[PDB]
Amino acid sequence: MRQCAIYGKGGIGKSTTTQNLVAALAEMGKKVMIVGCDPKADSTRLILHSKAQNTIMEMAAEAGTVEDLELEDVLKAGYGGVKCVESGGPEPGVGCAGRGVITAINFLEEEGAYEDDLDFVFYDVLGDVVCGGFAMPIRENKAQEIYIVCSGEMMAMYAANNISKGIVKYANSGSVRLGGLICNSRNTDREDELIIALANKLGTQMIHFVPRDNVVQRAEIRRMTVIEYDPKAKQADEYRALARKVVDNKLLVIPNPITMDELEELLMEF
Amino acid sequence: MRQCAIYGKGGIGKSTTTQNLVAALAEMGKKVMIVGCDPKADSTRLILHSKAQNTIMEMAAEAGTVEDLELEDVLKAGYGGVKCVESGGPEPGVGCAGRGVITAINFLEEEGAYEDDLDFVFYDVLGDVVCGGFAMPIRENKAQEIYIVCSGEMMAMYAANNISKGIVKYANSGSVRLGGLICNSRNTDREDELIIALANKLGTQMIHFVPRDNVVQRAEIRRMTVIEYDPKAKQADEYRALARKVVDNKLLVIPNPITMDELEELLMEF
Numbered sequence: 001m002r003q004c005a006i007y008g009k010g011g012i013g014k015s016t017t018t019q020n021l022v023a024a025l026a027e028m029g030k031k032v033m034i035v036g037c038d039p040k041a042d043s044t045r046l047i048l049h050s051k052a053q054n055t056i057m058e059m060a061a062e063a064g065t066v067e068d069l070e071l072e073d074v075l076k077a078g079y080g081g082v083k084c085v086e087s088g089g090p091e092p093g094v095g096c097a098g099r100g101v102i103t104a105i106n107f108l109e110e111e112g113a114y115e116d117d118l119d120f121v122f123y124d125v126l127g128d129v130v131c132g133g134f135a136m137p138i139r140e141n142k143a144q145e146i147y148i149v150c151s152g153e154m155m156a157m158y159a160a161n162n163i164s165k166g167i168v169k170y171a172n173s174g175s176v177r178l179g180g181l182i183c184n185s186r187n188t189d190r191e192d193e194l195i196i197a198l199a200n201k202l203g204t205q206m207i208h209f210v211p212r213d214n215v216v217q218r219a220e221i222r223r224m225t226v227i228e229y230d231p232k233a234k235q236a237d238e239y240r241a242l243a244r245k246v247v248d249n250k251l252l253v254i255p256n257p258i259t260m261d262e263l264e265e266l267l268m269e270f
Numbered sequence: 271m272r273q274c275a276i277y278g279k280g281g282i283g284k285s286t287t288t289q290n291l292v293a294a295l296a297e298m299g300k301k302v303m304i305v306g307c308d309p310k311a312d313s314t315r316l317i318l319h320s321k322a323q324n325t326i327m328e329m330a331a332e333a334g335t336v337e338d339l340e341l342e343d344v345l346k347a348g349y350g351g352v353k354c355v356e357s358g359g360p361e362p363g364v365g366c367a368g369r370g371v372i373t374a375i376n377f378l379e380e381e382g383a384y385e386d387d388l389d390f391v392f393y394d395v396l397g398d399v400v401c402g403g404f405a406m407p408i409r410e411n412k413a414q415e416i417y418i419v420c421s422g423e424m425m426a427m428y429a430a431n432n433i434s435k436g437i438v439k440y441a442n443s444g445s446v447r448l449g450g451l452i453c454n455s456r457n458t459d460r461e462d463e464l465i466i467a468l469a470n471k472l473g474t475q476m477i478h479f480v481p482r483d484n485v486v487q488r489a490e491i492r493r494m495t496v497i498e499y500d501p502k503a504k505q506a507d508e509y510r511a512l513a514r515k516v517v518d519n520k521l522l523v524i525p526n527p528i529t530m531d532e533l534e535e536l537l538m539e540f
């Protein structure tokens with residue numbers, strides 16, 4: 001079982017790429033579980049065809065405790081038998097994103113979710129704040145292979161660099177590695193070269209450049225992946241290519257985060 | 271002294287609006303302090319003309335303890351006498367954003383930084399994650415008047431709703447109240463009407479509509495507010511109008527957060 005996480009800042013299509021990647025993996029007959037850890041995205045919407053899956057935190061509140069919850073309530077099968085669960089974001093103003101994630105992981109462990117013939121687990125994690133709360137899947141030794149979704153944009157590359165700093169902290173004392181950068185295209189001048197340059201400075205790879213395509217939005221609107229919406233689409237082959245490279249990936253490194261001076265010089269050059 | 275906070279999702283110019291508002295208040299002769307609590311923005315860059323102000327956490331870590339810091343290391347004067355401090359984001363992968371914010375507040379209090387003849391303090395706070403960490407200004411009873419920056423985009427309005435839920439949690443514990451929505455225009459059709467409609471559902475007001483104007487970006491690239499860069503600009507009068515309405519504001523409410531179904535109804539009605 002390969003224990004993976006996708007990190008990246010919000011507003012650049014990270015969860016869309018995660019779900020289209022996972023759909024592409026299921027299409028190859030890989031048994032995949034998605035654990036949603038992102039309060040700014042619906043991590044399972046495009047797999048389950050559901051506007052917002054009920055979260056572990058929500059249904060522990062509704063039933064009043066977590067030992068009363070049944071796995072059937074929490075873990076739902078969608079496209080290609082992909083198993084979907086949502087941790088549930090922090091209680092507004094009071095909670096920590098880490099509480100939902102710890103609760104989800106402990107519940108899935110207890111209930112046997114991790115020994116049920118899985119090829120991949122993907123934690124879909126928000127990278128807007130690189131705090132201990134959003135590090136929970138790594139802290140719990142539940143994600144060893146990290147892929148970072150970024151774009152040729154200052155804040156997406158800053159987030160990629162800061163996520164890399166977090167990986168080094170848990171890699172100085174354990175098993176977590178960076179598997180690569182995924183570039184979600186923003187239809188930008190030679191954008192691929194910018195993310196390749198960043199990958200080269202970090203000591204990783206740009207594992208795929210995901211193009212901008214109308215078909216992604218068209219599929220999103222119908223609450224599905226491009227893989228399911230339009231399987232013969234050119235964009236469907238883009239996610240298949242990414243999925244094939246993840247499956248075959250051996251390049252799992254301790255990254256070399258860069259200085260703000262280095263990042264600024266990169267951005268100014270491009 | 272009026273203790274205010276600006277909350278809002280990242281990537282919509284919240285910190286640009288905060289600094290332009292504060293520069294307009296300083297131009298009017300108001301004595302203002304900005305406390306940066308946003309790891310996705312430089313909260314003081316446009317006031318100090320400096321790319322990244324040294325943060326209290328960075329300087330504390332270096333010096334061993336916060337008690338070894340001098341106030342002048344932390345608190346810098348910029349455009350119009352505006353005093354500027356940055357909390358410093360979480361230690362990547364391990365820290366909590368709340369730690370920098372409590373460290374900054376406690377240091378400023380002890381050093382007499384709030385004893386000065388200030389008219390306003392503005393906490394510039396990220397609203398991407400409405401956790402206990404980012405709620406610290408409210409929890410330490412240090413921000414009473416909340417203004418939410420949003421736009422006519424789904425996730426900006428979702429964040430405004432989530433921030434409102436955080437305010438409700440503390441509304442019976444102290445004088446923390448919502449003063450209004452500030453619309454940072456993204457040139458959406460009927461954007462002003464959409465945010466007026468949202469404010470009315472929440473039980474507040476759209477206190478000001480900030481237009482899209484390239485002079486904002488021309489000032490920002492030169493690390494300035496429009497107020498300093500081009501005080502004769504139409505856009506400078508927009509920030510002056512917002513500043514005067516905040517000064518005169520008497521509408522401070524316990525907001526009424528909406529359901530996702532209510533939010534979706536709004537979005538489709540526009």
Ligand code: SF4
Nearest residue numbers: 096131133366401403
């Ligand atoms: S650790 Fe992160 S998510 Fe948890 S409260 Fe702190 S900032 Fe928020």
